[PDB]
Amino acid sequence: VRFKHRYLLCELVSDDPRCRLSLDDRVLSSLVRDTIARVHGTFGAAACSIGFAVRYLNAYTGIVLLRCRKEFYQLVWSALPFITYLENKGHRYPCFFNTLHVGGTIRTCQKFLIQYNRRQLLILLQNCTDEGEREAIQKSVTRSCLL
Amino acid sequence: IHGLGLAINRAINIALQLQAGSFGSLQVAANTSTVELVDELEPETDTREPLTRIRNNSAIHIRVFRVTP
Amino acid sequence: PAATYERVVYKNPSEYHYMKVCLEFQDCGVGLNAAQFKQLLISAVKDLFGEVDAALPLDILTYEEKTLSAILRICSSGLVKLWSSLTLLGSYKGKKCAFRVIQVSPFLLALSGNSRELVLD
Amino acid sequence: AVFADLDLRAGSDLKALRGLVETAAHLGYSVVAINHIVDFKEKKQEIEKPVAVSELFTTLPIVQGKSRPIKILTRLTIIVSDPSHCNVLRATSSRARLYDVVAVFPKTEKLFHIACTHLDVDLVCITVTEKLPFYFKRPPINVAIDRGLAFELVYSPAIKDSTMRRYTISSALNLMQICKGKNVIISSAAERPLEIRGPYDVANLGLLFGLSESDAKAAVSTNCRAALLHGETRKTAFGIISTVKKP
Amino acid sequence: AVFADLDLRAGSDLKALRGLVETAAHLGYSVVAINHIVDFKEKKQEIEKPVAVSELFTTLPIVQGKSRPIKILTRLTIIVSDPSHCNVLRATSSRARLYDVVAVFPKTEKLFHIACTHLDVDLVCITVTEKLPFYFKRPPINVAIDRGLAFELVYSPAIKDSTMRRYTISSALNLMQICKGKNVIISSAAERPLEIRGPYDVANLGLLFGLSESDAKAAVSTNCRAALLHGETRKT
Amino acid sequence: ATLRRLREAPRHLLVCEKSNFGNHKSRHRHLVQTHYYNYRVSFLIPECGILSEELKNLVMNTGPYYFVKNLPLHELITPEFISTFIKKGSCYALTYNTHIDEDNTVALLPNGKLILSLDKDTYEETGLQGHPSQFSGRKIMKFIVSIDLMELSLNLDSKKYERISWSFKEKKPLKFDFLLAWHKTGSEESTMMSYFSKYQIQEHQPKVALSTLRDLQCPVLQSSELEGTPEVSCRALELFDWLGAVFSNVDLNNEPNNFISTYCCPEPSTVVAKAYLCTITGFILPEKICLLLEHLCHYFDEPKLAPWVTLSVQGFADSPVSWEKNEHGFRKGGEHLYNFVIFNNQDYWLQMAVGANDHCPP
RNA sequence: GCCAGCGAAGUGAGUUCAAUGGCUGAGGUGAGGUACCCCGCAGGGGACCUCAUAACCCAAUUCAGACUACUCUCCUCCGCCCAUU
């Protein structure tokens, strides 16, 4: 009496960070549902639209969580490399990148986001080498121990 | 991390590779002590008694902090 | 010369599926072509299965202009994907059309005789 | 194995109605049925003399199969939206017993449940036009498969707009994950003289819907036989059929 | 379990080249090699010091996966049209012994036969763009899989043209019917600083090419590992 | 689940056998004589511009076959019909244009086994002992009854014969359109026109299409290699795809344009100047093919310029039982066919085509 | 008739916006076939090839028991009718 879902993560890795400020659930739902109709036809455009919805999106961070079924996860996860030219008021060229295809199970999908976030700030220490930013890392470590 | 006299040859190996691995500020402090070791030996003979030898072995306490960089 | 015997039983060795093509139009202005029928096949699969399945390996064989009969073939992955796309009348200009299939067999030797009527009286 | 049944929704003139009979007789269709669209706005039910099959047809249908005449039957499809209109449909059990197979078109989840459990119909129309979302619940489906109720999953997306191709494949795949595919039939409502396909090609549009690897051929032959036979037990009686024979 | 070993075709400037290295280090890539376009038009031989990546890059490739440094290789892509240009490859094999993995681009099926049998290369470039007539024959494929010879499929369909999307998917499936997937790699060229895809993104892009249900993940991991393993004994 | 069945497979099978005509244990005669229904008979000979007059008289004398409109089933079980055609030869019957998965289909065997395929609306009304044929899930829709008429001929007053004869006359009338033919293997010769004088019987001749194809690109074959040597010979699988295109007038070259035809010839090949085409379209007796098979076996008595000849016989798409046991259905196509690639050293290739739901004998 | 509980890490599945019965290949058993081999009692075994392996249904702390929904199957007990001697 219940449906088995699949949850796939994405990451926008690009320069010119004004594109990361122009993110919205109305734009993202009009982007993914359109590019399936551009790569595939009207079959996958509606077979991946009866369970497709957005749940988690941070424009300042850049993590995209999408919904899809057990029977139709291979159409959304294959349409991800063909997403270019996010048309807006300016000139923007983003491109999604998967991290790990999680089979349902939101809890360990958020657990993989924690271990991905912890490995990003440790590499950022020596490469940036900023005194004002290193104090902001110490604010991130101290508040994480209070959790 | 703990370890005895054979183990501290490789217990020091997992600690130093964690510094290049985890890449963050992790302070390493070690503490040595003495671990007593009682050996028992007894053959299957009526006229014999188990002579319990005394022996000690070296240990370490390699302590890894989480130092804010 | 020699004399021997060999028993080899293959299980799906073909990897191809041939189709007899029949077309029906309303108006008598059949301005089609062998190059234009190939364009009608690509744009029809693009509307249902998309651009990836639009370039499946398919070719036109013994195409005729008056009878409008041809032979197409796609592999075992694309036999289902061609029946579906041409069902919904993928017309060229905008005038309504129909696509009706006479016979389907994976070999031209089984396709050449008949399967539909099987005797014409 | 009665093969290649249809459910046509077209009446305006005898020139277009006879053309659909000769076209269906050409490809594979042995039994062709005609629906009658009845809406809730007009509240009109022309039941008395609607078609006159024996009077308004030229006496000889010819198919390329067994060269048997077409069993031309008259069916009924009622667009139902309000519960204050289904009471007239529940009053047809004793007033006017015509239209051998009766199909219903629900629009409300409170009205879809009574049509599959309480209301005595033969098939249920599920078509989605112009952004009509509808949830498919499992208790009204699991009773209908044992009762004998089938579903007219009527497809006609290639008439006007290509956006209607999405709403046919979306509502069908919502059904196939839930109904499991026990008795679901497919047919095309054709108003133009070329909107009908051969029944050997129809069986892949049900396999485009999925539904089986093999029962998609039986969704037009076997499940259409059990859906036509449900209208025969509703017409005369459920246990005893008394026929007058005069040689 | 050495994963995500792909190759790039990239030289215009040091700013655009290092941007592709830092992007590939971000996603999943632990082996990134730079290809060089050599054709019959200019006939140049820059083998000794083409880029010198280790003398220009700032000594720290860091990935966010296994957190290991990147083994950066140097590979060569020779565009061969005429058989007189194919004899140049047999002359430079003993003069300058560099470019550890050698990839050749054939155009003629008579030249494709000696490339799979007689010509000593490691990978075979197969790119069909804008109506390039080249059909595949089954006996030259069956020799190359027993020899250990690999076949490339370089794609960039998503940005430049939509007409080029069809020739990359149709010419692929002409090879999938014959080669069966014994040693097939799928790399991508990148001239713009964002023309690369993720590490697990190739695993469905190989399934988008068909070819497998599970071994398409091995087309970026296992078959890419055999390029350096077979090419190391060719150099020594 | 939903994406697997859109691209997986239909069921198809091919069995390839090489053998010798001179072998004492060869079943090249038994597999043709016990194959019951034949519609398309086509044979090819490369480099043959002048046909031999003995083979030309054999093509024109394959039939004839008769067609009777609205013939009931109780006529075929009378003792007059059994003693005329069945007891003194082999009579064949096939209900024309009644598909195997749509309506009732009745077939007759030369051994006297009236094997008929009925649906659920007829199998319950006739009351004849049968068994299911193909499972369609749970609702079994087709049944097949085997009625041996030769065992009923010993005791005509038995309880088995009166159960069947009453089931067709007064219990269930069933008329059909039969494709009737008879092989003359009896002392007293009586034509079929004299017996069926009441119903509308029509004598039909097989359609003969004689053609000559020029500049055909034939492959290179080795009879002692079925899988095909690399760059020397070809695979026997590759000829079975090539052979249908020659009969369907498909012989083209590579054309890089908007209409690219990706149909290459199986290599290595040999340019052959002339190729003789024939198509015998009608209800063909299998005994006439046995005189055709032995004539093609005796075609290489003289040193000919052709390395190998062709004999390919295609059956119906409506045959209930072929190959003595195989219940041929119809699942979106699927036809039964066999092939003979006869060489000069009395060796032949047996390529049997198996449809969707069908089995194969040795 | 009435009276007795413990917030503390981690279920030979342990999910909780609710993971998991996968594919291919080779077998078992149940039908069908042999121009194949061995044992020599007309017989039997092996080898090879084709096909069926499901329906009912879904873990949410666990276990025992009753009840109910079932057939690719095996065991026990029988009925009806057909045909044979």
From Swiss-Prot, chain B:
Protein location: Nucleus, Nucleolus; Cytoplasm; Cytoplasmic granule
Phylogenetic lineage: Eukaryota, Metazoa, Chordata, Craniata, Vertebrata
Species per Swiss-Prot/TrEMBL record: Homo sapiens (Human)
Name of the molecule in the record: Ribonuclease P protein subunit p20
Role: Component of ribonuclease P, a ribonucleoprotein complex that generates mature tRNA molecules by cleaving their 5'-ends. Also a component of the MRP ribonuclease complex, which cleaves pre-rRNA sequences.
Similarity comment text for this entry: Belongs to the histone-like Alba family.
Subunit structure, interactors included: Component of nuclear RNase P and RNase MRP complexes. RNase P consists of a catalytic RNA moiety and 10 different protein chains; POP1, POP4, POP5, POP7, RPP14, RPP21, RPP25, RPP30, RPP38 and RPP40. Within the RNase P complex, POP1, POP7 and RPP25 form the 'finger' subcomplex, POP5, RPP14, RPP40 and homodimeric RPP30 form the 'palm' subcomplex, and RPP21, POP4 and RPP38 form the 'wrist' subcomplex. All subunits of the RNase P complex interact with the catalytic RNA. Several subunits of RNase P are also part of the RNase MRP complex.
UniProtKB/Swiss-Prot annotation, chain C:
Residues spanning the membrane: none
One GO location term (cellular component): multimeric ribonuclease P complex
Keyword Chloroplast in record: no
Predominant place of localization: nucleus
Molecular function (Gene Ontology), one example: ribonuclease P activity
Classification via InterPro entries: Pop5/Rpp14/Rnp2-like (IPR002759), Rnp2-like_sf (IPR038085)
Pfam families associated with the record: RNase_P_Rpp14
Cellular localisation: Nucleus, Nucleolus
Keywords: Nucleus, RNA-binding, tRNA processing
Example of a GO biological process term: tRNA 5'-leader removal
Family per record: Belongs to the eukaryotic/archaeal RNase P protein component 2 family.
Subunit architecture: RNase P consists of a catalytic RNA moiety and about 10 protein subunits; POP1, POP4, POP5, POP7, RPP14, RPP21, RPP25, RPP30, RPP38 and RPP40. Within the RNase P complex, POP1, POP7 and RPP25 form the 'finger' subcomplex, POP5, RPP14, RPP40 and homodimeric RPP30 form the 'palm' subcomplex, and RPP21, POP4 and RPP38 form the 'wrist' subcomplex. All subunits of the RNase P complex interact with the catalytic RNA.
Miscellaneous: This protein is produced by a bicistronic gene which also produces the HTD2 protein from an overlapping reading frame.
Function: Component of ribonuclease P, a ribonucleoprotein complex that generates mature tRNA molecules by cleaving their 5'-ends.
PANTHER family membership: RIBONUCLEASE P PROTEIN SUBUNIT P14
Protein name: Ribonuclease P protein subunit p14
Swiss-Prot record, chain E:
InterPro entries cross-referenced by the UniProt entry: Pol/histidinol_Pase-like, RNase_P_p30
Pfam families: RNase_P_p30 (PF01876)
A Gene Ontology biological process term: tRNA processing
Keyword RNA-binding on entry: yes
The keyword Acetylation is assigned to this record: yes
Quaternary structure note: Component of nuclear RNase P and RNase MRP ribonucleoproteins. RNase P consists of a catalytic RNA moiety and about 10 protein subunits; POP1, POP4, POP5, POP7, RPP14, RPP21, RPP25, RPP30, RPP38 and RPP40. Within the RNase P complex, POP1, POP7 and RPP25 form the 'finger' subcomplex, POP5, RPP14, RPP40 and homodimeric RPP30 form the 'palm' subcomplex, and RPP21, POP4 and RPP38 form the 'wrist' subcomplex. All subunits of the RNase P complex interact with the catalytic RNA. Several subunits of RNase P are also part of the RNase MRP complex.
Function noted in UniProt: Component of ribonuclease P, a ribonucleoprotein complex that generates mature tRNA molecules by cleaving their 5'-ends. Also a component of the MRP ribonuclease complex, which cleaves pre-rRNA sequences.
Alphabetized PANTHER family for the sequence: RIBONUCLEASE P PROTEIN SUBUNIT P30, RIBONUCLEASE P SUBUNIT P30
Record-stated family: Belongs to the eukaryotic/archaeal RNase P protein component 3 family.
Misc remark: Autoantibodies against RPP30 are found in sera from scleroderma patients.
Protein name per UniProt: Ribonuclease P protein subunit p30
Gene coding for it: RPP30
From Swiss-Prot, chain F:
Subcellular location: Nucleus, Nucleolus
Database matches in InterPro entries: RNase_P_Rpp40
Lineage top rank: taxon: Eukaryota
Keywords: Nucleus, RNA-binding, rRNA processing, tRNA processing
One GO term (biological process): endonucleolytic cleavage in ITS1 to separate SSU-rRNA from 5.8S rRNA and LSU-rRNA from tricistronic rRNA transcript (SSU-rRNA, 5.8S rRNA, LSU-rRNA)
GO CC terms: multimeric ribonuclease P complex; nucleolar ribonuclease P complex; nucleoplasm; nucleus; ribonuclease MRP complex
Major location category of this protein: nucleus
GO molecular function terms attached to this record: ribonuclease P activity; ribonuclease P RNA binding
Function according to Swiss-Prot or TrEMBL: Component of ribonuclease P, a ribonucleoprotein complex that generates mature tRNA molecules by cleaving their 5'-ends. Also a component of the MRP ribonuclease complex, which cleaves pre-rRNA sequences.
Subunit structure: Component of nuclear RNase P and RNase MRP ribonucleoproteins. RNase P consists of a catalytic RNA moiety and about 10 protein subunits; POP1, POP4, POP5, POP7, RPP14, RPP21, RPP25, RPP30, RPP38 and RPP40. Within the RNase P complex, POP1, POP7 and RPP25 form the 'finger' subcomplex, POP5, RPP14, RPP40 and homodimeric RPP30 form the 'palm' subcomplex, and RPP21, POP4 and RPP38 form the 'wrist' subcomplex. All subunits of the RNase P complex interact with the catalytic RNA. Several subunits of RNase P are also part of the RNase MRP complex.
This protein's name: Ribonuclease P protein subunit p40
Organism: Homo sapiens
